[PDB]
Amino acid sequence: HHENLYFQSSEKEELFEKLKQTADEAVQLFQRLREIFDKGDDDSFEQVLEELEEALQKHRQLADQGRKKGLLTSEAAKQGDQFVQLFQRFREAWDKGDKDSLEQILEELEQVAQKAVELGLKILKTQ
């Protein structure tokens, strides 16, 4: 029989801890990606880019899991869609060698990332 995750305090807490753990790893990788980009190490850049893509995908799957189990769709979903779309453009600029678009998108990604940190952690307090 079905019960909303909202009312399963023990299982919901475990999901929320995994959400914060994967967010923390993705945010750490995003900050290292910025530092590597400034240093200009290609191999290190591509490595951290793949690790960040994998960490972001795991974070987003956990968010989808909570919503499938009953939680309402929060404003963090749409704001995270904005980050994912910009992040895919960033990766596509790197694939194509468009360093012009790369640096411009990265500045915009830094602002969207800070909003995602603030919005996601605020919303989690009352989900």
Ligand SMILES: [Cl-]
């Ligand atoms: Cl959500």
